[PDB]
Every structure is written in C-alpha cells, then in structure tokens.
Coordinates of C-alpha atoms in Angstrom, one line a residue:
Chain A
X1 CA 12.7 17.9 11.6
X2 CA 10.5 15.3 9.7
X3 CA 8.2 16.2 6.8
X4 CA 6.8 13.0 5.1
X5 CA 7.5 12.9 1.3
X6 CA 4.4 11.0 0.1
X7 CA 0.8 11.3 1.3
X8 CA 0.2 8.2 -0.9
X9 CA 2.7 6.1 1.2
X10 CA 1.4 7.5 4.5
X11 CA -2.3 6.8 3.6
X12 CA -1.7 3.3 2.3
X13 CA 0.2 2.5 5.6
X14 CA -2.5 4.2 7.8
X15 CA -5.5 2.4 6.1
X16 CA -3.7 -1.1 6.1
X17 CA -3.1 -0.6 9.9
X18 CA -6.8 0.4 10.4
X19 CA -7.6 -2.9 8.7
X20 CA -5.3 -5.4 10.7
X21 CA -4.8 -3.3 14.0
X22 CA -1.3 -4.9 14.3
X23 CA 0.5 -2.9 17.0
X24 CA 3.9 -3.7 15.3
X25 CA 2.7 -1.6 12.3
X26 CA 1.4 1.4 14.5
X27 CA 3.2 4.7 13.7
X28 CA 2.8 8.1 15.6
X29 CA 2.2 9.6 12.0
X30 CA -1.2 7.9 12.3
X31 CA -2.6 9.9 15.3
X32 CA -3.4 13.1 13.2
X33 CA -5.2 10.8 10.7
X34 CA -7.2 9.1 13.6
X35 CA -8.6 12.6 14.6
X36 CA -10.5 12.6 11.2
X37 CA -12.7 9.6 12.5
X38 CA -15.1 12.3 14.0
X39 CA -16.1 13.3 10.3
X40 CA -18.0 9.9 9.9
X41 CA -20.5 8.3 12.5
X42 CA -19.9 4.6 13.2
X43 CA -23.7 3.9 12.5
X44 CA -23.4 5.3 8.9
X45 CA -20.6 2.8 7.8
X46 CA -22.9 -0.3 7.2
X47 CA -25.0 2.0 4.8
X48 CA -21.9 3.4 2.9
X49 CA -20.7 -0.2 2.4
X50 CA -24.2 -1.3 1.2
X51 CA -24.2 1.8 -1.2
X52 CA -20.7 0.9 -2.6
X53 CA -22.0 -2.7 -3.4
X54 CA -18.7 -4.0 -1.9
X55 CA -18.1 -7.8 -2.2
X56 CA -15.5 -9.9 -0.3
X57 CA -12.6 -9.0 -2.7
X58 CA -13.2 -5.1 -2.5
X59 CA -11.7 -2.4 -0.3
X60 CA -13.6 0.9 0.0
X61 CA -15.1 1.8 -3.4
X62 CA -15.5 5.6 -2.7
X63 CA -16.4 6.7 -6.2
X64 CA -19.7 4.6 -6.0
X65 CA -20.9 7.0 -3.2
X66 CA -21.5 9.7 -5.9
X67 CA -20.2 12.2 -3.2
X68 CA -17.9 14.7 -4.8
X69 CA -14.5 15.9 -3.5
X70 CA -14.5 19.7 -4.0
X71 CA -12.3 20.7 -1.0
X72 CA -9.9 19.5 1.7
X73 CA -12.7 18.9 4.2
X74 CA -14.4 16.5 1.6
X75 CA -10.9 14.9 1.1
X76 CA -10.5 14.4 4.9
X77 CA -14.0 12.7 5.1
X78 CA -12.9 10.3 2.3
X79 CA -9.9 9.3 4.4
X80 CA -12.2 8.8 7.5
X81 CA -14.7 6.6 5.4
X82 CA -11.7 4.6 4.0
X83 CA -10.4 4.2 7.6
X84 CA -13.7 2.9 9.2
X85 CA -14.7 0.7 6.2
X86 CA -11.1 -0.8 6.4
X87 CA -11.6 -1.4 10.1
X88 CA -15.2 -2.8 9.7
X89 CA -14.6 -5.2 6.7
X90 CA -11.9 -7.2 8.7
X91 CA -8.5 -8.7 8.0
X92 CA -8.9 -10.9 4.8
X93 CA -6.4 -12.0 2.1
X94 CA -8.9 -11.6 -0.8
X95 CA -9.3 -7.8 -0.4
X96 CA -7.7 -6.1 -3.5
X97 CA -6.3 -3.0 -1.8
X98 CA -4.6 -1.8 -5.0
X99 CA -8.1 -1.1 -6.6
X100 CA -9.4 0.7 -3.5
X101 CA -6.3 2.9 -3.3
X102 CA -6.5 3.6 -7.1
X103 CA -10.0 5.1 -6.5
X104 CA -9.1 7.0 -3.2
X105 CA -6.0 8.7 -4.8
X106 CA -7.8 9.6 -8.1
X107 CA -10.4 11.4 -5.9
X108 CA -8.0 13.2 -3.4
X109 CA -4.4 13.4 -4.8
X110 CA -5.1 17.0 -5.9
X111 CA -5.3 17.8 -2.1
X112 CA -2.1 16.0 -0.9
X113 CA 0.0 19.3 -0.4
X114 CA -2.9 21.0 1.5
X115 CA -3.6 17.8 3.5
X116 CA 0.1 17.6 4.6
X117 CA 0.1 21.3 5.8
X118 CA -3.3 21.0 7.5
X119 CA -2.4 17.8 9.4
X120 CA 1.4 18.1 10.1
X121 CA 2.2 21.8 9.4
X122 CA 3.1 24.4 12.1
Chain B
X1 CA 2.0 -17.7 17.3
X2 CA 1.7 -15.2 14.4
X3 CA 0.7 -16.1 10.8
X4 CA 0.2 -12.9 8.6
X5 CA -3.3 -12.9 7.0
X6 CA -2.5 -11.0 3.7
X7 CA 0.7 -11.3 1.5
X8 CA -0.8 -8.2 -0.3
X9 CA -0.6 -6.1 2.9
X10 CA 2.8 -7.4 3.9
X11 CA 4.3 -6.8 0.3
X12 CA 2.9 -3.3 0.1
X13 CA 4.4 -2.4 3.5
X14 CA 7.8 -4.1 2.6
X15 CA 8.1 -2.3 -0.8
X16 CA 7.1 1.1 0.6
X17 CA 9.8 0.6 3.4
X18 CA 12.4 -0.3 0.7
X19 CA 11.5 3.0 -1.0
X20 CA 11.7 5.4 2.0
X21 CA 14.1 3.4 4.4
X22 CA 12.2 5.0 7.4
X23 CA 13.4 3.0 10.5
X24 CA 10.0 3.9 12.2
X25 CA 8.3 1.7 9.4
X26 CA 10.8 -1.3 9.7
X27 CA 9.2 -4.6 10.8
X28 CA 10.9 -7.9 11.6
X29 CA 8.4 -9.4 9.0
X30 CA 10.7 -7.8 6.4
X31 CA 13.9 -9.8 7.1
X32 CA 12.7 -13.0 5.3
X33 CA 11.8 -10.7 2.3
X34 CA 15.3 -9.0 2.3
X35 CA 17.0 -12.5 1.8
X36 CA 15.3 -12.5 -1.7
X37 CA 17.6 -9.5 -2.7
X38 CA 20.3 -12.2 -3.8
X39 CA 17.9 -13.2 -6.7
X40 CA 18.7 -9.9 -8.6
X41 CA 22.2 -8.3 -9.0
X42 CA 22.4 -4.5 -8.2
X43 CA 24.1 -3.9 -11.6
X44 CA 21.0 -5.3 -13.5
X45 CA 18.5 -2.8 -11.9
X46 CA 19.3 0.2 -14.2
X47 CA 18.6 -2.0 -17.3
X48 CA 15.3 -3.5 -15.9
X49 CA 14.2 0.2 -15.2
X50 CA 15.2 1.2 -18.8
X51 CA 13.4 -1.9 -20.2
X52 CA 10.2 -1.0 -18.2
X53 CA 10.3 2.5 -19.8
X54 CA 9.5 3.9 -16.3
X55 CA 8.9 7.7 -15.9
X56 CA 8.9 9.8 -12.7
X57 CA 5.3 8.9 -11.9
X58 CA 5.8 5.0 -12.2
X59 CA 6.7 2.3 -9.7
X60 CA 8.1 -1.0 -11.0
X61 CA 6.2 -1.9 -14.2
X62 CA 7.0 -5.7 -14.0
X63 CA 4.7 -6.8 -16.9
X64 CA 6.9 -4.8 -19.4
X65 CA 9.9 -7.1 -18.7
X66 CA 8.0 -9.9 -20.7
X67 CA 9.4 -12.4 -18.1
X68 CA 6.7 -14.9 -17.1
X69 CA 5.8 -16.0 -13.6
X70 CA 5.4 -19.8 -13.8
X71 CA 6.6 -20.8 -10.3
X72 CA 7.3 -19.5 -6.7
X73 CA 11.0 -18.9 -7.6
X74 CA 9.9 -16.6 -10.5
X75 CA 7.5 -14.9 -8.0
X76 CA 10.3 -14.4 -5.4
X77 CA 12.4 -12.7 -8.1
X78 CA 9.5 -10.3 -9.0
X79 CA 9.5 -9.3 -5.2
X80 CA 13.3 -8.8 -5.3
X81 CA 13.1 -6.6 -8.5
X82 CA 10.2 -4.6 -7.0
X83 CA 12.3 -4.2 -3.8
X84 CA 15.5 -2.9 -5.6
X85 CA 13.6 -0.8 -8.2
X86 CA 11.7 0.8 -5.2
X87 CA 15.0 1.5 -3.4
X88 CA 16.8 2.8 -6.5
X89 CA 14.0 5.2 -7.8
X90 CA 14.0 7.3 -4.5
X91 CA 11.4 8.7 -2.2
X92 CA 9.1 10.9 -4.4
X93 CA 5.5 12.0 -4.0
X94 CA 4.6 11.6 -7.8
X95 CA 5.2 7.7 -7.8
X96 CA 1.7 6.0 -8.3
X97 CA 2.3 2.9 -6.2
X98 CA -1.3 1.7 -6.7
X99 CA -0.5 1.0 -10.5
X100 CA 2.8 -0.8 -9.6
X101 CA 1.0 -3.0 -7.0
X102 CA -1.9 -3.7 -9.4
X103 CA 0.7 -5.3 -11.8
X104 CA 2.8 -7.1 -9.2
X105 CA -0.3 -8.7 -7.6
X106 CA -1.9 -9.7 -11.0
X107 CA 1.5 -11.5 -11.7
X108 CA 2.1 -13.3 -8.3
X109 CA -1.2 -13.4 -6.3
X110 CA -1.6 -17.1 -7.4
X111 CA 1.6 -17.9 -5.3
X112 CA 0.6 -16.1 -2.1
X113 CA -0.2 -19.3 0.0
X114 CA 3.0 -21.0 -1.3
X115 CA 5.1 -17.8 -0.6
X116 CA 3.7 -17.5 3.0
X117 CA 4.7 -21.3 3.7
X118 CA 8.1 -21.0 2.0
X119 CA 9.1 -17.7 3.9
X120 CA 7.4 -18.0 7.3
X121 CA 6.4 -21.7 7.5
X122 CA 8.0 -24.2 9.9

C-alpha cells in the first residue's frame, strides 16, 4: 500500500493546489486535507489576513496570529487557515511561498507523524 | 491557451517530483524542465553535494557553490543542479525544502519572466 514519506512535501503540494485550483495538479491525497476546511469559517478569513498584516508578496503568516499550536487539533486548524488564505489571496507570481512554508512547518512539524496517522492511518 | 502564473509554484512542484518520482504527481509542465538535465553531468552531483556541506535535513544549498547567477543560462543550470540533487538525496521526511527553495529563489527569481518565455513561449 502507499504511506507518504513527507508531510512537508504533501502540504506544500496541497496548499499550492488550493491557491491555483489547477485540476492537472489535483491529487486524491488532498481529499483528507480538504475535510479540515470545516475547522475555519469562510467569514473569519478576511480578519485572519488583516491580523497577519499580509502584503501582496506574502503567503499565510500564521505566527502573527499569536495562536499557539499545543496539539494536533491546533495543527489541523493551521493547515485549514493556510488552505483558505491560499485560496482567497489568488494566483499571483509575487507570493513568496518559501517564507509562508518556513513559518507553517516551524509551527507544526512536531505533529507530522501524528497528522499522517490521524489522516491516512487505518 | 495556458501560461503558468508562478515560476515559484512550478519549480517547487517540479523539484519535489524529482525527489519522490511519484507518477501521480507527474505533470506535462515538467518535460521542458527535464531538458535542462543536460546542463549538469550525473558524475558531478556527488561533488556539488560534498561542496554544499549538505546534511540529512538539507535540500540543495546552491549559495554554498559560490557560482554566481549572472544570466538565464546560469539560472537554468541552478534548476538542473536542484533537480539532480533532489533526485540523488532520496525521499526523506527530515529534508527542510523551505530553506532550499528560499536559496534557489533568492538566486534566480530575477530571471522568472525570461525563464517562462524561454521554456514555454512561442
């Protein structure tokens, strides 16, 4: 069977696909990550973006929310926020995804093993 | 017709696919980038990795080569080195791709428009 080697690799692909919605870059691996959208209301996203003081060259700047990641549920919500901010900011060349991903992974990499089990485990 | 919005997004996807060789993550956008493999001999890759002083947690650390990027040809060769180092280091969770991509894009983002034209232009 498949077990994906790198939560980093999978999350980068997922979030870039939420940004461009290119059906040639869809992957069935993404449907367990799309279920996490329920953890964040669409009406809260504009406020999260305002609070992160995001400019045109920024992806999600999750550390500026001053919302801690203490458990896997908190980690799942950071993926959901990343996903909806990525969708809402639009497909644009100037977005420095590397900086966004540096912040996301600093905040959640501790949870990667537990996230893989919880999402794709039997 | 298609014209891809973000050389960042395309290069991250390309290099992660060169790393895991997952056929579910292949994209026809990648074949123009695979032609650049000729710019770097397979026998030079072990030396480039040694010179970059790469550990288990590192992707390509291109700035440690002290090889400048002065033109699009130099930029294309940095994508080829990234591609073959990614393939050669193997699929591993500890690789901090964000740091690798931060370095690559600092070095080549000036060339993104000229790279898009040269690779995918008519």
